[PDB]
Amino acid sequence: HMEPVDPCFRANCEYQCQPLNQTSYLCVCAEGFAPIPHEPHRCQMFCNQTACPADCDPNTQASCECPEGYILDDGFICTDIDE
């Protein structure tokens, strides 16, 4: 199964890699999954604060995402009406 480890294709992206590109390679996740409180790879998700809460949408509820990821359940959380 193996690995040239790409660069990445292994890296050890919790999720995964770009690979690279200016990062040279990083690690992705589901790409608003992104460096939680800590390690330079992680997701969990992105929730760059001042909270994200919860408070999903109005209308569509595509929403409250992160389920999958979860593990939810602060608020409900994980979406930043923020900016």
Ligand X SMILES: *[C@@H]1O[C@H](CO)[C@@H](O)[C@H](O)[C@H]1NC(C)=O
d(CA 46, CA 73): 15
Using rule CB under 6 A, residue 21 touches ligand X: yes
Binding to ligand X by residue 6, rule CB under 6 A?
no
Query: Quick one: which segment of 45-53, 56-64, 65-73, 74-82 binds ligand X (CB under 6 A)?
Result: 45-53
Nearer to ligand X, 50 or 59 (CB): 50
Residue 27 engages ligand X in binding (rule: CB under 6 A): no
Binding residues vs ligand X (CB under 6 A): 18-21, 34-37, 46-49
